[PDB]
């Protein structure tokens, strides 16, 4: 009888893993601060990694990788990509991004940022940007506007190139993003969940008024709120992969695998292999797994762009059941024994 | 040459002291009766080994050590043991009633009645010192004597020898190695009163030493003799530069200069490799690269913690055996590329290296195989604060209910010393997090 | 080091005699006090319970107390009767009539100073006395009333030694008289105040064990005392045999007692034996020793939470297996150990097994479930006291009803204190 | 990677390699504290002996 504790009540996905585990009849939940657990489903903030792996006679496992937040905070990720030789400043799948500290706080790139802007305006290039942080987003061609706005707010912001030429689904002439769920187990196997989702805009994309941000922001929250046509084409403004595949076959004569998924698997693999030496628990006295949400954009040339990585994602309603069963299968029962829904991401090219 | 006095307090400090002096004798060629044939300057000297041994007219080489236990059974085994002749009776000090795992009983009650006798015995050793640098203090955190008496001794040594340096070797408590239920209390209390009196302190988590002994020595249930011979190797690694010719860490002050830039953050992590079983039939010797790499595996540290999630303030490699500078730099080069080694911004990213060509000596019949090269890394990383987090949490659980508190007040301690000590530790954890974390 | 042992009253002397018979046989010492063993481990800690005599004979540091001479004459007549220092037989003639008041205030007061004189002579011959252990019952008059008077006097004269008792709790299933709840309630208050650790031995539990699992249809006091002897040998192993744990009660007291009044321990033994040959495995020892059916206090551990636990394994066995099994009852039943005392289970081992077994385990629980014992005594007390029944036996020796009201108030307080930590 | 302050002797060598440059109470206060605890003990003992005398 394995033992576990729950320290995030507000997590849709690990609530279901909690119940799935009880139903085995071989897992018993302890109280929050009982230290004699096998498994910790821990808090989002200030998870006490320093207290794991010190209980004699207990293999211990937590559902978070210590250090994985350098992938999962906007400013961190930018700094990680620019500084890590495996990703490089010359990184083809990440949008141009610059970290910007507000002036109250006074590292920061804001004047090497305008180098690029000035280069671009004198270059007659498309020159929309987007400022963002880790709801408070500004899309503007006015650089002199953008650094205005960052400093009115008090936390650090990322300025990133805006994807002016996105792939738009028809009918709708409308934007979307792709969310992938990836599970990294204690062995640092990288598992892509076979089902993703497209979070679609229900507004036609208009490239001349970025001041209105509902055809520009595909967040499920904003679409159910502000936009006239939520639910119009897709249930919950969520398109799944079988549909998006068929559309690509009919509309563009390709498939999801060739045109988009190869790129996505390469981005996932590259991100997680980059931080693997910093967060691996291979020789550690406790063990980690974690579920990530990767968010990609597709431009009209079917090039895939990573926009962010989410360290504590929620699932799509229809997929909770299958994903959560899969987390128990490969993350938990792998360590505590009682056709796969994941694609193992491994590549060993010789050079 | 400047002399160093070793002070061993309580059971843990005495038994580890015996391991250390056994090893030292084997390393310097001193026999159990104190004779050192190779010492050609008979009855005197100022060689490097003289910092730890004094000499008598007859040619006896005598540890600059005092043993102190509040009950006799542990030091009696010194008095009757195979190194009986090594020590002067005046250096072995025993009470008759111990501190019963109670910090307050060792500090206040039993301490008051023996502290002056100990300082007088300590003074007899200081008086045969042309130039004393200070003290090496061996004790457990969890014992009543090792915690309570030691902190009283540390306070008085600050008074009676204020310009001297004081280093500690402190066994941190682990439930796997027999443990009183109030050892978290004792730990926090003695850390709080010793913090300003100690210039540098090497913590040894009995949990890490235990697991090294099971995993690398194939000892399924390690004894204190197993644990202490390993600890003794590590301590010997750390002190060898005071006992041997060289130019790194040549006096106690250099330990603080080289390892402790911030004086409160004075807890260097020790990592040691390789530990090889003497029962291992076929063993292939490990290289300079391989043993230096092993310095960055947590399974080899004296305190299990994760240095990737902290920052370094200093780092020394002490090698013993067949090691030459260019292999160290080649090994360091390859390691910086494959490993998370981040320093605080105001320190250089660099390694002070010391090589002594004599490989580690092993106690005959011990558990450690002889090796051709070994290294002990001393890194002052903020990741060691994990051990304070663990201790403090356990302290918090018990003190919320005042469990066992009545035992301390009964010795004359005031409850408020508990919360004072816990508040100091609260500051220390935040210092560590200031230095070693940048904001999320 | 040295412990001075006292046994008071009928039950105190019968169990105390059989304790000294059992452990003297362990240590090789024969009925004339002459050693005859084959190991030096038998004599390394022999000084804790024995004085060395002229001729290096071993004499128990044991004082034998009663207000009548009957039982002690049976002891002097008994198997090991001559092992005892004759000067240490201290007895009155009148008895205490199962009357706490006679034990504590009248008959016993007359005898107590002479008991303290023998205590003092045994203390002075001690290199470094650590404290005292008393065996007595709480349901009669001598062990209950005089025993607690002695405990009070001894604390006055030695306030810094450890006081330790093995106290037999009365039960209507093994009952001599109706006034036992009165005697026991009066005694319990003394124990809360003036001992450091009390082993609660419930005659209820000893009966059920003898009946339900030893299959003894008509258990005698002899059967009950077999169990008590075996348990007493087990809890005193560290006091009598070499080990990594030395022989001192203070350290045990410090690690078992988080709050001074809650020092009432539920003992247990495995395998439960009547006076077989099957090998008991380490997993079996461990499962049994924690089994409610092996507890000598008729309380259900699952009704409370363990504050602290001490466990003592005897025999040749794998401590790796011992460590494993201990870790797995605590990891598999972590509900029943308070989370606010980390690592509150301690395990000791001793190579030497008791007579007739190759492997035994002794359990020592400080559980809040022990309140059930005190509630039970309290309900029996109250059922008589609300009618002032049988009080005249006590008022006739000078006691007032107020002192009864105070004693039950004290025991109900102790019960509330246990309850407070079962919910904390 | 600079290798500096090399020192040799017959026992061994030492040096420093740099990957990258930077970016007490009185005796009387103690004996007082020890005596204040001692009187807290002797008080509590007097409270016990007073209680025992009652
Ligand atoms: N590594 C190691 N730890 C020890 C040793 N002896 C005791 N310890 C540990 O120290 C703690 C107990 O402290 P002790 O040194 O035995 O206590 P003490 O200082 O003698 O004080 P009292 O016995 O309370 O008077 C426990 O955590 C032990 O595991 C030893 O020889 N080696
Ligand atoms: C004289 O009798 C005995 C003495 C000791 C004993 C001697 C020396 N030191 C200690 C330390 C603990 C001890 C006790 C309980 C503990 C811990 C840690 C957690 N918990 C709950 C430590 N016990 N002990 C031990 C015995 O058996 C367990 C004895 O017999 C019952
Ligand atoms: N450089 C960029 N170019 C084009 N669109 C972008 C963009 N950056 C963000 N977006 C759009 O903004 C939306 C969300 O931005 P953001 O990166 O902050 O996600 P989010 O953290 O707010 C919610 P979640 O964490 O679930 O993804 C994306 O879905 C995308 O539609
Ligand atoms: N287990 C056990 N209980 C006893 C024994 N003798 C008496 N008892 C119980 O002790 C209580 C009576 O106490 P007793 O010792 O005879 O009175 P005292 O002689 O005045 O101290 C009752 O609970 C009896 O059941 C005995 O030998 N063994
Ligand atoms: Ca010389
Ligand atoms: Ca100082
Ligand atoms: Ca009379
Ligand atoms: Cl000085
Ligand atoms: Mg986000
Ligand atoms: Mg001791
Ligand atoms: Mg009777
Ligand atoms: Mg008199």
C120 shares its domain with C167: yes
Closest protein CA for atom 14 of ligand 4: C140
CB C373 within 8 A of CB C169: yes
Q: Where are the beta strands (DSSP E) in chain A?
A: 2-6, 27-29, 39-41, 61-62, 97-100, 129-132, 138-140, 157-161, 176-184, 190-193, 197-200, 238-239, 287-288, 290-298, 304-310, 342-344
Q: What is the DSSP letter of C296?
A: S
DSSP C67-93: SSSHHHHHHHHSTTGGGS-GGGEEE-S
> Chain-centre distance of CA C122, in angstroms?
21
Q: Interhelix angle for B415-436 vs B385-399, to 10°?
A: 150
Residue C56 Rama label (left phi>0; alpha psi -120 to 50; beta): left
- The boundaries of every CATH 3.30.470.20 domain in chain A are 69-70+167-344
| Phi, psi for residue B159 in degrees, rounded to 5 | -70, -55
> How many independent structural domains does chain C possess?
3
Q: What share of chain B is helix, strand, coil (3-state, %, to 5)?
A: 45, 20, 35
Whether residue A36 lies within 8 A of chain C, CB to CB, comes out as yes
CB B314 within 8 A of CB B379: yes
What Å distances lie between residue B263 and A65, B17, B255, CA to CA?
32, 26, 12
C375 shares its domain with C359: no
* Domains in chain B: boundaries: 1-268, 269-383, 384-440
Q: Which residue of A has its CA nearest to C326?
A: A57
DSSP A284-323: SSSEE-EEEEEEEEEBTT--EEEEEEESSPPPPTTTHHHH
Give Cβ neighbours of residue C298 (< 8 Å, ≥ 6 apart): C171, C202, C204, C205, C208, C372, C373, C376
C149 shares its domain with C248: yes
Binding-site residues of C for GDP: 10-11, 98, 137, 140-143, 174, 176, 180, 203, 221, 225
Question: Nearest ligand, CA of residue B266?
Answer: 6
Whether residue D37 lies within 8 A of chain C, CB to CB, comes out as no
Question: What is the four-CA torsion angle of C205, C211, C217, C223, rounded to 10 degrees?
Answer: -50
C345, containing H or E segment: strand C345-350
| Phi, psi for residue C306 in degrees, rounded to 5 | -75, 120
User: Strand, coil or helix: what is C5?
Assistant: strand
CB C343 within 8 A of CB B181: yes
Omega before A217 cis (within 30°)? Answer: no
Q: Which of C352, C369, C386 is the last residue of a domain?
A: C369
Give Cβ neighbours of residue A50 (< 8 Å, ≥ 6 apart): B305, B385, B386, B389, B390
What Å distances lie between residue B415 and B110, B368, B390, CA to CA?
19, 46, 22
CB A290 within 8 A of CB A184: yes
C268 shares its domain with C252: no
User: Strand, coil or helix: what is A186?
Assistant: coil
Residues of B with a catalytic annotation lie at 254
Mutate to test the interface with A, among B173, B386, B430 (most CBs of A within 10 A): B386
Tell whether the torsion through CA atoms of C290, C293, C296 and C299 is positive or negative: positive
What tokens does B267 get? Answer: 């807890």
C291 shares its domain with C353: yes
Distance D4 CA to ligand 9 centre (A): 48
Q: What is the DSSP letter of A116?
A: H
Give C42-71 as a 3 state SS string: HHHCHHHCEEECCCCCEEECEEEEECCCHH
CB A308 within 8 A of CB A31: no
Beta strand A197-200 pairing with A176-184: antiparallel
Rounded to an integer, what distance in angstroms lies between the CA atom of residue C208 and that of residue C202? 10
Beta strand A290-298 pairing with A176-184: antiparallel
Paired residues of A299 in beta bridges: A166
Q: Nearest CA to CA, how far is B321 from chain D (Å)?
A: 9
Report how this structure was experimentally obtained: X-ray
Q: Which of C258, C281, C308 is the last residue of a domain?
A: C258
C360 shares its domain with C396: no
CA atoms within 13 A on the CB side of C412: 11
Beta strand D2-8 pairing with A129-132: unpaired
C98 shares its domain with C229: yes
Hunting for tokens 């690398």 — which residue is that? B216
Contact (CB<8Å) B109/D26:
no
CB B69 within 8 A of CB B103: no
Query: Is the CATH number 3.40.50.11480 carried by domain A2-68?
Result: yes
Which domain does C412 fall in, by range? 370-424
Contact (CB<8Å) B325/D11:
no
Whether residue C55 lies within 8 A of chain D, CB to CB, comes out as no
Whether residue B338 lies within 8 A of chain A, CB to CB, comes out as yes
| Residue B96, burial from CB neighbour count under 10 angstroms (0-12, 13-18, 19+) | exposed
| Residue A344, burial from CB neighbour count under 10 angstroms (0-12, 13-18, 19+) | exposed
| Phi, psi for residue B428 in degrees, rounded to 5 | -55, -40
Q: Which residues of A touch C324 (CB under 8 A)?
A: 57
Taking residue B379's Cβ as centre, other Cβ atoms within 10 Å add up to 24
Contact (CB<8Å) D41/B109:
yes
Under CATH, which number does the domain A69-70+167-344 receive? 3.30.470.20
CA-closest candidate to residue A187, choices A79, A72, A284, A89: A284
Hunting for tokens 């008979």 — which residue is that? B42
Task: Kindly state if the Cβ of A97 falls inside 6 Å of ligand 3.
Answer: no
Q: Which of C236, C258, C280 is the last residue of a domain?
A: C258
Q: What is the DSSP letter of A21?
A: H
CA-closest candidate to residue C343, choices C332, C331, C355, C351: C331
Paired residues of A45 in beta bridges: none
CA-closest candidate to residue B126, choices B93, B99, B91, B173: B91
């Amino acid at each position: 009888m394995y033992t576990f504790v729950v320290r995030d009540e507000n997590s849709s996905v690990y609530a279901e893993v909690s119940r799935l585990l009880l139903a085995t009849g071989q897992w018993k939940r302890l109280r929050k601060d009982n230290p004699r657990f096998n498994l910790m489903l821990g808090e989002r903030n200030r998870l006490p990694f320093g207290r794991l792996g010190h209980e004699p006679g207990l293999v211990q496992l937590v559902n978070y990788y210590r250090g994985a937040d350098k992938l999962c905070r906007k400013a961190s990720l930018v700094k990680l990509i620019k500084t890590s030789p495996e990703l490089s400043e010359s990184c083809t799948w990440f949008p141009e991004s610059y970290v910007i500290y507000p002036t109250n706080l006074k590292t920061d790139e804001r004047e090497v940022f305008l180098a690029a802007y000035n280069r671009r305006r004198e270059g007659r290039e498309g020159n929309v940007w987007i400022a963002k942080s880790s709801e408070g987003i500004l899309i503007s061609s006015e650089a002199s506007e953008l650094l205005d706005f960052i400093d009115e707010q008090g936390q650090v912001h990322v300025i990133q190139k805006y994807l002016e030429k996105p792939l738009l689904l028809e009918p709708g002439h409308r934007k979307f993003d792709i969310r992938s769920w990836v599970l990294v187990d204690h062995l640092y196997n990288i598992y892509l969940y076979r089902e993703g989702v497209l979070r679609t805009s229900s507004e036609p994309y208009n490239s001349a008024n970025f001041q209105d941000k509902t055809c520009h922001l595909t967040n499920h929250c904003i679409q159910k709120e502000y936009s006239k046509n939520y639910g119009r084409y897709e249930e919950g403004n969520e398109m799944f992969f079988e549909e998006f595949n068929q559309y690509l076959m009919d509309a563009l004569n390709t498939t999801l695998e060739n045109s988009i998924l190869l790129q996505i698997k390469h981005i996932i693999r590259s991100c997680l292999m980059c931080i693997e030496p910093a967060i691996s628990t291979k020789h550690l006295h406790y063990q980690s797994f974690q579920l990530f949400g990767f968010d990609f954009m597709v431009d009209e040339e079917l090039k895939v762009w990573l926009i962010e990585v989410n360290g504590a994602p929620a699932c799509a309603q229809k997929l909770y059941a299958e994903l959560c069963q899969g987390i128990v299968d490969v993350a938990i029962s792998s360590v505590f024994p009682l056709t796969s829904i994941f694609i193992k991401l491994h590549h060993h090219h010789h050079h | 040459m400047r002399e160093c006095i070793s002070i061993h307090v309580g059971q843990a400090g005495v038994q580890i002291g015996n391991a250390c002096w056994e090893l030292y004798c084997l390393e310097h060629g001193i026999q159990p009766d104190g004779q050192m044939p190779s010492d050609k300057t008979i009855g005197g000297g100022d060689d490097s080994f003289n910092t730890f041994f004094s000499e008598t007219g007859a040619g006896k080489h005598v540890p600059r050590a005092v043993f102190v236990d509040l009950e006799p059974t542990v030091i009696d085994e010194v008095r009757t043991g195979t190194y009986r002749q090594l020590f002067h009776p005046e250096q072995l000090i025993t009470g008759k009633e111990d501190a019963a795992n109670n910090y307050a009983r060792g500090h206040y009650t039993i301490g008051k009645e023996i502290i002056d006798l100990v300082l007088d015995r300590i003074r007899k050793l200081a008086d045969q010192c042309t130039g004393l640098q200070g003290f090496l203090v061996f004790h457990s955190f969890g014992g009543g004597t090792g915690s309570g008496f030691t902190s009283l001794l540390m306070e008085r040594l600050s008074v009676d020898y204020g310009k001297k340096s004081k280093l500690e070797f402190s066994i941190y408590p682990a439930p796997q190695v027999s443990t009183a239920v109030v050892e978290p209390y004792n730990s926090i209390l003695t850390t709080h009163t010793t913090l300003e009196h100690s210039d540098c302190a090497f913590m040894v988590d009995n949990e890490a030493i235990y697991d090294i002994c099971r995993r690398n020595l194939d000892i399924e249930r390690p004894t204190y003799t197993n644990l202490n011979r390993l600890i003794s190797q590590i301590v010997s690694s750390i002190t060898a530069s005071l006992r041997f010719d060289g130019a790194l860490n040549v006096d106690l002050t250099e330990f603080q200069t080289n390892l402790v830039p911030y004086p409160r953050i004075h807890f260097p992590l020790a990592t040691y490799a390789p530990v090889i079983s003497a029962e291992k039939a076929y063993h292939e010797q490990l290289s300079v690269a391989e043993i230096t790499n092993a310095c960055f595996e947590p399974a080899n540290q004296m305190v299990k913690c994760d240095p990737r999630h902290g920052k370094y303030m200093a780092c020394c490699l002490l090698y013993r055996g067949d090691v030459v500078p260019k292999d160290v730099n080649a090994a360091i080069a390859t390691i910086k590329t494959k490993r998370s080694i981040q320093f605080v911004d105001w320190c250089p990213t660099g390694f002070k290296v010391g090589i002594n060509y004599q490989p580690p000596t092993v106690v005959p019949g011990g558990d450690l195989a002889k090796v051709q090269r070994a290294v002990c890394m001393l890194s002052n990383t903020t990741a060691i604060a994990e051990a304070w987090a663990r201790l403090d949490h356990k302290f918090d659980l018990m003190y919320a209910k005042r469990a066992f508190v009545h035992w301390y007040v009964g010795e004359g301690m005031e409850e408020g010393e508990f919360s004072e000590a816990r508040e100091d530790m609260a500051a220390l954890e935040k210092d560590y997090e200031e230095v070693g974390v940048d904001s999320v | 080091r040295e412990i001075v042992h006292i046994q008071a009253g009928q039950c105190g002397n019968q169990i105390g005699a059989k304790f000294w018979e059992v452990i003297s046989d362990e240590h090789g010492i024969d009925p004339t006090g002459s050693y005859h063993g084959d190991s030096d481990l038998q004599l390394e800690r022999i000084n804790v319970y024995y004085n060395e005599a002229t001729g290096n004979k071993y004499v128990p540091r044991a004082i034998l107390v009663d207000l009548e001479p009957g039982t002690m004459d049976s002891v002097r007549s008994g198997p090991f009767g001559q092992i005892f220092r004759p000067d240490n037989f201290v007895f009155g003639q009148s008895g205490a009539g199962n009357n706490w008041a006679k034990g504590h205030y009248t008959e016993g007061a007359e005898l107590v100073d002479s008991v303290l004189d023998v205590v003092r002579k045994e203390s002075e011959s001690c290199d470094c006395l650590q404290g005292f252990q008393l065996t007595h019952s709480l349901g009669g008059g001598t062990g209950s009333g005089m025993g607690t008077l002695l405990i009070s006097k001894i604390r006055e004269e030695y306030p810094d030694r450890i006081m330790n008792t093995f106290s037999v709790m009365p039960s209507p299933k093994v009952s001599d008289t109706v006034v036992e709840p009165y005697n026991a309630t009066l005694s319990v208050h003394q124990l809360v105040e003036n001992t450091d650790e009390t082993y609660c031995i419930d005659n209820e539990a000893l009966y059920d064990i003898c009946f339900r699992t030893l299959k003894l249809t008509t258990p005698t006091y002899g059967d009950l005392n077999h169990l008590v002897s075996a348990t007493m040998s087990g809890v005193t192993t560290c006091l009598r045999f070499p080990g990594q744990l030395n022989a001192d009660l203070r350290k045990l007291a410090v690690n078992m007692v988080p709050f001074p009044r809650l020092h009432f321990f539920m003992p247990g033994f495995a395998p439960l034996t009547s006076r077989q040959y099957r090998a008991l495995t380490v997993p079996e020892l461990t499962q049994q020793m924690f089994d409610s059916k092996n507890m000598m206090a008729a309380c259900d551990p699952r009704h409370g939470r363990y504050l602290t636990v001490a466990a003592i394994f005897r025999g040749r066995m794998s401590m790796k297996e011992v460590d494993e099994q201990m870790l797995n009852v605590q990891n598999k039943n972590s509900s029943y150990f308070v989370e606010w005392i980390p690592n509150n289970v301690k395990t000791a081992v001793c190579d030497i097994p008791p007579r007739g077994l190759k492997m035994s385990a002794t359990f020592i629980g400080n559980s809040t479930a022990i309140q059930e014992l005190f509630k039970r005594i309290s309900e029996q007390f109250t059922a008589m006291f609300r009618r002032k029944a049988f009080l005249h036996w006590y008022t006739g020796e000078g006691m007032d009803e107020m002192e009864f009201t105070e004693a039950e108030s004290n025991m109900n307080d102790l019960v509330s204190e246990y309850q407070q930590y079962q919910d904390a | 990677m600079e290798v500096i302050e090399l020192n040799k002797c017959t026992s061994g060598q030492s040096f420093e390699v740099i990957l990258k440059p930077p970016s007490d109470p009185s005796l009387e206060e103690i004996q007082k504290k020890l005596e204040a605890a001692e009187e807290r003990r002797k008080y509590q003992e007097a409270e016990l002996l007073k209680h025992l005398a009652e």
